[PDB]
Amino acid sequence: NYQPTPEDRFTFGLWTVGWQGRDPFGDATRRALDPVESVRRLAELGAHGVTFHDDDLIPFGSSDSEREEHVKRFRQALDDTGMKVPMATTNLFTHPVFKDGGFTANDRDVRRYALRKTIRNIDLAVELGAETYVAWGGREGAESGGAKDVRDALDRMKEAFDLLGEYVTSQGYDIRFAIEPKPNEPRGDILLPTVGHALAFIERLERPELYGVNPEVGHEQMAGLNFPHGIAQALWAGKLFHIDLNGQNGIKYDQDLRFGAGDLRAAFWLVDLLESAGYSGPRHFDFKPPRTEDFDGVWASAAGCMRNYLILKERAAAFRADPEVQEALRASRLDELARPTAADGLQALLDDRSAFEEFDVDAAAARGMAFERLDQLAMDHLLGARG
Amino acid sequence: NYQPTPEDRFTFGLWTVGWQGRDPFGDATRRALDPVESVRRLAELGAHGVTFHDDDLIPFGSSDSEREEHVKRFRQALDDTGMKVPMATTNLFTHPVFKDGGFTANDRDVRRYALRKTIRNIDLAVELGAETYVAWGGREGAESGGAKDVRDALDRMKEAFDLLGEYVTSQGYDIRFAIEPKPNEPRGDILLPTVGHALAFIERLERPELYGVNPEVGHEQMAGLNFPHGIAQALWAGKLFHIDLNGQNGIKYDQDLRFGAGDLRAAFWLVDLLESAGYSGPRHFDFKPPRTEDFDGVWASAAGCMRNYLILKERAAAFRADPEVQEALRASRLDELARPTAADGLQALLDDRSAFEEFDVDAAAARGMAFERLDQLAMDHLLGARG
Amino acid sequence: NYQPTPEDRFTFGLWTVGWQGRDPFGDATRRALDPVESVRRLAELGAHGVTFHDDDLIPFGSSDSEREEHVKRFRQALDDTGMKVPMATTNLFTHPVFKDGGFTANDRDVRRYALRKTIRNIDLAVELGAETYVAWGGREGAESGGAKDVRDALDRMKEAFDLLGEYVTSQGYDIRFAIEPKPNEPRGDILLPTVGHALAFIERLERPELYGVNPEVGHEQMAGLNFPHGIAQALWAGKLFHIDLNGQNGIKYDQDLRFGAGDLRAAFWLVDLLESAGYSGPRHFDFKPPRTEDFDGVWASAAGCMRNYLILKERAAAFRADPEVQEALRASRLDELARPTAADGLQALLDDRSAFEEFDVDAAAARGMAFERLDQLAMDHLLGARG
Amino acid sequence: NYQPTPEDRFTFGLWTVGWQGRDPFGDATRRALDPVESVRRLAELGAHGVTFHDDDLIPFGSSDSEREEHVKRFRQALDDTGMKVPMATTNLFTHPVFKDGGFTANDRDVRRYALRKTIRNIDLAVELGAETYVAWGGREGAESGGAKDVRDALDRMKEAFDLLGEYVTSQGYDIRFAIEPKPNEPRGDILLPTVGHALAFIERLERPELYGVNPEVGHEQMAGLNFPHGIAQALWAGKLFHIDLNGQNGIKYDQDLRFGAGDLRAAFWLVDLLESAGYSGPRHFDFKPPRTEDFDGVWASAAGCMRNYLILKERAAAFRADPEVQEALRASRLDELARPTAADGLQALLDDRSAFEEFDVDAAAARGMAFERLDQLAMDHLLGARG
Ligand SMILES: OC[C@H]1O[C@H](O)[C@H](O)[C@@H](O)[C@@H]1O
Ligand SMILES: OC[C@H]1O[C@H](O)[C@H](O)[C@@H](O)[C@@H]1O
Ligand SMILES: OC[C@H]1O[C@H](O)[C@H](O)[C@@H](O)[C@@H]1O
Ligand SMILES: OC[C@H]1O[C@H](O)[C@H](O)[C@@H](O)[C@@H]1O
Ligand SMILES: [Mg+2]
Ligand SMILES: [Mg+2]
Ligand SMILES: [Mg+2]
Ligand SMILES: [Mg+2]
Ligand SMILES: [Mg+2]
Ligand SMILES: [Mg+2]
Ligand SMILES: [Mg+2]
Ligand SMILES: [Mg+2]
């Protein structure tokens, strides 16, 4: 039951199942995974593809020769399995040189290095067939107010993304960029902290059509925000290029639990939205198997990611297909929300006495919205207490 | 010491000092204030002007005749005192008819009523000299996932703001709009929950140049965000039309404490930013004197708002003027952050071996940022432990 | 399906279904309910009983004669229906006289009034058959640091509860007290803000055996705490006298959603714990039907409270009864957690070389905990994707 | 100005200035410090003493011979400088064997190992003169609901602490235990998550007089709680054995900023409380110099910890000594809060018609508390805008 297949478009970062379990207070609990073994094990589980940071695949500081041998091994595993590489990204956060950022480091020579490191991996990603290149500015930010002039930092961030856009267009690459927001951790505050801030920033770039967002469930929830609402605004703007699925229990450190864990009802409304809006991009899991687990637990946790998506998809489809739910949606006037407020125009609205002078405000106020009955039907469907 | 005068541009909402103290669990503790008395008392304290919701000035449901008598009394108090009215707004949240929203209510007849109520007060605001018209969509949102299709709701929100822009341009009014974000309360989640989401939404309106943001200190802090950082992004985008100053102690209900209370160091960095960027709009206080206070406490709390701004302005100016702080800023390379990363261009950057092939990553990584010394100089200046 | 009956011990406050919908930013959306009608409607829904504040039943300031007529009407409705009154409480938060608290008001005459108001309602509660008397100190606290000496306030709080204990013991009443914690709202910070703080305070009272806690789901979640964990500590201490069930979406204002809404997985683990520990007290719902709803929505929301408890009870029972889950619990060594660490004693432990000198730390470290497989079985059971 | 000396009782953990800067997303940015160099550098800065985990001083897995050489080097540095060791603790969180906890690991052999590792370091701590032994149960907890039966885990936690108490009493040691709470990180939820929960747990131990709390500023603030209020309850109970001073910006990952950073006004009210209550224990800094800093920044950050305490102490003393503040405290009736509510007794209170029957509730309700004027005097004193 609920068996994933490649058509479900489930993808995983190499750094997810490969997380060794080292956290701020503890050493690694698992040995390092060979990327070739991860490709083969994920293929057997029914995954569609994998993603990577440059430093996940090529150990930092590798010579041009060692680099080639790592890529060839990886490519052969992809060719044997038919696994895809739909997305790639750069590690601009682990090495100590990035301790004050990559694109917005105060030191200019670090900013130039960060751009050259990124451009090198764009070339590789395009070769492997990636359609989306993700940027997570995890070190862009500050712990103290005087350390970063944020207006200058946004100038430097815009400069960097404009140069990347000039690079891909000059090379004729068919790849787009997605900014992944996070409000904090590892910096005290991170620049572009939410989906909203990232969407607003994109509109000031020279070629906005090349950039979208890669929202992550847990990151918006670290600010206490409604993740389905934020995804809806991204879809409304035409900017949902990619998505990171996982779980998070409220406002605390970034947990990266398996998808379905954390806020389960938010996961249900998210899947309802993605499916009903026809999102066609990868369903990418950015999660960490807890460091309590051995390698059997790693693959159990990865399998649970896909299983929970498929269960929620079934329940959301049954919710929307139920005639009693359709009746409830009409009782709550969800259909009237789709009607234009004033397609008759401004002047007609101003001359309409039923819109103000003769509007019966008390009769309208007395109408119940019937939202609680609708939400209990949604709860019944999620829990399988009806079909 | 620290005496406010009208040139300091301090303004107050009628609903602030006039808050009667009724909260979700308690009845009012103060009698209602006559708006004329508030104008005169605020003028004596050194305020520059006042702001209002329509329903603060004209009791809801007033006839056209009673409406005129309320406005004339108010105008005469303004004329006697020289007090200005730089901003006005609509109450689309108190009356039960708005229980599911104004512009994004599911019921279409409510949405049309909300627009007509708003347009009526724009006319009045322009007559009184307001330059900014604020919209706080406090009822736009939901408690449950099925109650609101957020994509349709954003269509309805865009429709409403586009119609308001068509109205002001057809009337030839010199007034601009500012959206005030809030993440939650009184709805479970509110649409456009942060400065970022509001900035992104503005870019999809038909005439974006007419719209900016009115961020409030406490509202961004209800999402755990850095308020100075968010203000910096608004300034970077050219969209800081107005601002609401108050205090908030972390992630909880909207406290609306007097400015300076709450996160004191964030208040310092905010004033540093506003003054150094040359913000020239009103310094508006959206605060509630706690319901523990009598009327003497109301005016003490209002006076403290202005006093704390003036103290922080002095400390921030002394911080920036100190040669030792200027030296510390250079030691932390704040000046290098202002330099373009690659004004030599993409091709020069790609051919620069010092940017990658011969970049000494370990030497760069070993440089300390000296951020802690800089921040302790900032602390010393805030506390007056140096000048 | 999932029909509640009186044996399920579901109870409701008069103030829950009777909430008129007035919130900090809006007027009431529903008319006031007659307490007699609430008793009859709740009886028809299958509820076991009702609870009340004094001021819910007797309008504040009622003469001794009017008081009697309100009580007689209420008693007759209870007698007609067989409905029970298992708990009562005092309103020490609505009237402006309590704006700085009841038991810990700075003014001594207010503290004496608060005790006399409480004692009067204890007499009534005992007459009606209440077994638990709840105290929620919603106004005990402060917005600013200098307003309240917290050590003196705790002296005054201990004094008040000791006097109440002396009163009930001198009257020979068979009633116990339960303190209901809340971290904030309506005060900036409330004294005894969590279950832990309340449990610790009880141990300093003169007769600790008379006092326990009444934890509320949403209140502990307003501090980001794990509500099942806190309930477990209360059960471990023998102090879970009563419980308030509802829902809350994270760290924000007190939402009081219907039970099952909010954190659904926390609701599942809560019901699992209550049932497996054999909690025998009332399942009391302290919730507010959203002000979007008319009276049909009020009773739908109340019915959903009980329905969701009954569904979760079924799923938790099926989880614990599943042989595959029992196997998983053994694989994760939940049974070894029940074994004493050192029943052989301190000296035996010190002389045991297998406990340190010859302990194979690397072999033990390599054991996986198999927690993810167990949690996915729990998810499958919650969602009805197995039985 | 504000020069620390040993009489100020400032202490530092070896792990604080010695933090190498490795965080969940990045490698170390600083080389390891020799504990002997830390002792000498801290002595030169004016510190009173140092603290340590066992594994800070003796590398894990050291032979009995290597162990002796590490201790002798350390002791000689203490003897040369006169530096004290007032507190020690155990590392039960870094090694992978503790991935599910120490005292509450599901595996019984791990729990026995954790006790033997702790007991070994108690012996060493007593030899070096420690008066307090701290326990931070950082791995005691869970990421998922089924992984930990919390009632059994509390049984195991009580068993462990009872055995430690039996050990110290059988050895005749003059050392007490302090539990350090934290709500989360690195586990999803940690057992005993706040000061309140820890105080309540202590009361169920066999010898409660041996145990107190070691609260940390940032940890209580990770739950959004008022740290001065929690310290006040700990002092009221007689249980403040030790304290961890640092800074934290709201609800997020554990930042461990230098003291004074984070919530500056909470730091002021904390110092006011500690000094006015006559706390005589160490002022211990548990902080991490940000990984942006080199070694000069490490010692600047450590110096700032002590400087900020000394500045706040001066401002709080001036606040309390100001006759205008004393007048304000009387106007807010802080002195009436110290008066017993009913020293005349229960029967006198019941027969007092002025306490209820003839209490003028409206006159009492009309009294303002004058809290805002008092708080602005506190703000003026903190900022040095009066003396
Ligand atoms: O940007 C790709 C990934 O980089 C880092 O691993 C982040 O922790 C993760 O959130 C992000 O998705
Ligand atoms: O929009 C004007 C004002 O309206 C309401 O009173 C809001 O509570 C306040 O935040 C806002 O500034
Ligand atoms: O104490 C009884 C009740 O009093 C108030 O209505 C509180 O809001 C509620 O939480 C509590 O349960
Ligand atoms: O218990 C001693 C110390 O141990 C760990 O380093 C904790 O992170 C710190 O909070 C605690 O004070
Ligand atoms: Mg994450
Ligand atoms: Mg991610
Ligand atoms: Mg506000
Ligand atoms: Mg505002
Ligand atoms: Mg509540
Ligand atoms: Mg309650
Ligand atoms: Mg800490
Ligand atoms: Mg600590």
PDB file of N, CA, C and O and ligand atoms in Angstrom, chain B residues 15 53 87 89-90 93 134-136 180 182 214 216 219 244 254 256 284 286 288, chain C residues 25, ligand 2:
ATOM      1  N   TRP B  15      -6.785  56.381  18.525  1.00  0.00           N
ATOM      2  CA  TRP B  15      -7.107  55.123  19.179  1.00  0.00           C
ATOM      3  C   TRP B  15      -6.042  54.679  20.168  1.00  0.00           C
ATOM      4  O   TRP B  15      -6.243  53.668  20.852  1.00  0.00           O
ATOM      5  N   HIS B  53      -8.707  56.341  12.507  1.00  0.00           N
ATOM      6  CA  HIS B  53      -9.675  55.576  11.728  1.00  0.00           C
ATOM      7  C   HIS B  53     -10.950  56.392  11.573  1.00  0.00           C
ATOM      8  O   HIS B  53     -11.298  57.186  12.452  1.00  0.00           O
ATOM      9  N   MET B  87      -1.811  61.168   8.312  1.00  0.00           N
ATOM     10  CA  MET B  87      -2.193  59.822   7.917  1.00  0.00           C
ATOM     11  C   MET B  87      -3.602  59.545   8.420  1.00  0.00           C
ATOM     12  O   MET B  87      -3.997  60.027   9.484  1.00  0.00           O
ATOM     13  N   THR B  89      -6.849  56.150   8.099  1.00  0.00           N
ATOM     14  CA  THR B  89      -7.068  54.738   7.804  1.00  0.00           C
ATOM     15  C   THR B  89      -8.542  54.410   8.036  1.00  0.00           C
ATOM     16  O   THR B  89      -9.318  55.237   8.523  1.00  0.00           O
ATOM     17  N   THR B  90      -8.928  53.197   7.652  1.00  0.00           N
ATOM     18  CA  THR B  90     -10.310  52.740   7.750  1.00  0.00           C
ATOM     19  C   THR B  90     -10.410  51.668   8.824  1.00  0.00           C
ATOM     20  O   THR B  90      -9.501  50.847   8.972  1.00  0.00           O
ATOM     21  N   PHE B  93     -12.464  46.225  10.780  1.00  0.00           N
ATOM     22  CA  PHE B  93     -12.260  45.080  11.667  1.00  0.00           C
ATOM     23  C   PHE B  93     -13.181  45.021  12.878  1.00  0.00           C
ATOM     24  O   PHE B  93     -13.402  43.919  13.389  1.00  0.00           O
ATOM     25  N   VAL B 134      -3.340  54.410   5.278  1.00  0.00           N
ATOM     26  CA  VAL B 134      -2.868  53.105   5.745  1.00  0.00           C
ATOM     27  C   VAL B 134      -3.996  52.090   5.634  1.00  0.00           C
ATOM     28  O   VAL B 134      -5.165  52.406   5.886  1.00  0.00           O
ATOM     29  N   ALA B 135      -3.647  50.861   5.245  1.00  0.00           N
ATOM     30  CA  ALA B 135      -4.576  49.738   5.255  1.00  0.00           C
ATOM     31  C   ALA B 135      -3.981  48.626   6.102  1.00  0.00           C
ATOM     32  O   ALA B 135      -2.911  48.099   5.770  1.00  0.00           O
ATOM     33  N   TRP B 136      -4.679  48.263   7.180  1.00  0.00           N
ATOM     34  CA  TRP B 136      -4.333  47.114   8.012  1.00  0.00           C
ATOM     35  C   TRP B 136      -5.446  46.094   7.840  1.00  0.00           C
ATOM     36  O   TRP B 136      -6.568  46.312   8.312  1.00  0.00           O
ATOM     37  N   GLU B 180      -0.032  47.804   6.121  1.00  0.00           N
ATOM     38  CA  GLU B 180       0.542  47.484   7.423  1.00  0.00           C
ATOM     39  C   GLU B 180       0.434  45.989   7.684  1.00  0.00           C
ATOM     40  O   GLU B 180      -0.680  45.485   7.906  1.00  0.00           O
ATOM     41  N   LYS B 182       0.739  42.257   9.610  1.00  0.00           N
ATOM     42  CA  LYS B 182       0.682  41.635  10.928  1.00  0.00           C
ATOM     43  C   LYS B 182       0.523  40.148  10.680  1.00  0.00           C
ATOM     44  O   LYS B 182      -0.268  39.771   9.806  1.00  0.00           O
ATOM     45  N   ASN B 214       3.672  50.190   5.814  1.00  0.00           N
ATOM     46  CA  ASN B 214       3.666  50.826   7.131  1.00  0.00           C
ATOM     47  C   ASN B 214       4.017  49.742   8.145  1.00  0.00           C
ATOM     48  O   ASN B 214       3.125  49.190   8.809  1.00  0.00           O
ATOM     49  N   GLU B 216       5.204  47.842  11.536  1.00  0.00           N
ATOM     50  CA  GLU B 216       5.071  48.115  12.962  1.00  0.00           C
ATOM     51  C   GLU B 216       6.077  47.262  13.719  1.00  0.00           C
ATOM     52  O   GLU B 216       6.180  46.061  13.461  1.00  0.00           O
ATOM     53  N   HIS B 219       4.744  43.994  15.300  1.00  0.00           N
ATOM     54  CA  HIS B 219       4.165  42.984  14.417  1.00  0.00           C
ATOM     55  C   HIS B 219       5.241  42.093  13.809  1.00  0.00           C
ATOM     56  O   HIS B 219       5.085  40.866  13.761  1.00  0.00           O
ATOM     57  N   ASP B 244       5.134  52.545  12.205  1.00  0.00           N
ATOM     58  CA  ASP B 244       4.459  52.448  13.495  1.00  0.00           C
ATOM     59  C   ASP B 244       5.493  52.055  14.541  1.00  0.00           C
ATOM     60  O   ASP B 244       6.101  50.979  14.442  1.00  0.00           O
ATOM     61  N   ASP B 254      -0.254  40.776  20.545  1.00  0.00           N
ATOM     62  CA  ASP B 254       0.200  42.116  20.157  1.00  0.00           C
ATOM     63  C   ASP B 254       0.103  43.048  21.363  1.00  0.00           C
ATOM     64  O   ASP B 254      -0.998  43.399  21.797  1.00  0.00           O
ATOM     65  N   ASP B 256       1.670  46.231  21.949  1.00  0.00           N
ATOM     66  CA  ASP B 256       1.627  47.674  21.690  1.00  0.00           C
ATOM     67  C   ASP B 256       2.132  48.478  22.894  1.00  0.00           C
ATOM     68  O   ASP B 256       1.514  49.456  23.319  1.00  0.00           O
ATOM     69  N   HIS B 284       5.387  57.793  13.998  1.00  0.00           N
ATOM     70  CA  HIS B 284       4.030  57.551  14.471  1.00  0.00           C
ATOM     71  C   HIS B 284       4.049  56.474  15.545  1.00  0.00           C
ATOM     72  O   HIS B 284       4.672  55.425  15.357  1.00  0.00           O
ATOM     73  N   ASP B 286       1.989  53.767  17.527  1.00  0.00           N
ATOM     74  CA  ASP B 286       0.798  52.928  17.606  1.00  0.00           C
ATOM     75  C   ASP B 286       0.964  52.097  18.871  1.00  0.00           C
ATOM     76  O   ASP B 286       1.509  50.995  18.840  1.00  0.00           O
ATOM     77  N   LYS B 288      -0.587  51.271  23.153  1.00  0.00           N
ATOM     78  CA  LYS B 288      -1.717  51.261  24.069  1.00  0.00           C
ATOM     79  C   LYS B 288      -1.177  51.504  25.465  1.00  0.00           C
ATOM     80  O   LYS B 288      -0.389  50.679  25.956  1.00  0.00           O
TER      81      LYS B 288
ATOM     82  N   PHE C  25     -10.255  43.325  19.020  1.00  0.00           N
ATOM     83  CA  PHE C  25     -10.424  44.231  17.891  1.00  0.00           C
ATOM     84  C   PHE C  25     -11.833  44.227  17.320  1.00  0.00           C
ATOM     85  O   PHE C  25     -12.040  44.771  16.232  1.00  0.00           O
TER      86      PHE C  25
HETATM   87  O1  LIG E   2      -4.105  50.504  10.516  1.00  0.00           O
HETATM   88  C1  LIG E   2      -4.209  51.417  11.582  1.00  0.00           C
HETATM   89  C2  LIG E   2      -4.208  50.626  12.853  1.00  0.00           C
HETATM   90  O2  LIG E   2      -5.375  49.829  12.845  1.00  0.00           O
HETATM   91  C3  LIG E   2      -5.535  49.007  14.002  1.00  0.00           C
HETATM   92  O3  LIG E   2      -5.805  49.779  15.164  1.00  0.00           O
HETATM   93  C4  LIG E   2      -4.291  48.155  14.250  1.00  0.00           C
HETATM   94  O4  LIG E   2      -4.402  47.444  15.494  1.00  0.00           O
HETATM   95  C5  LIG E   2      -3.018  48.991  14.219  1.00  0.00           C
HETATM   96  O5  LIG E   2      -1.904  48.129  14.156  1.00  0.00           O
HETATM   97  C6  LIG E   2      -2.971  49.769  12.932  1.00  0.00           C
HETATM   98  O6  LIG E   2      -1.817  50.570  12.862  1.00  0.00           O
END
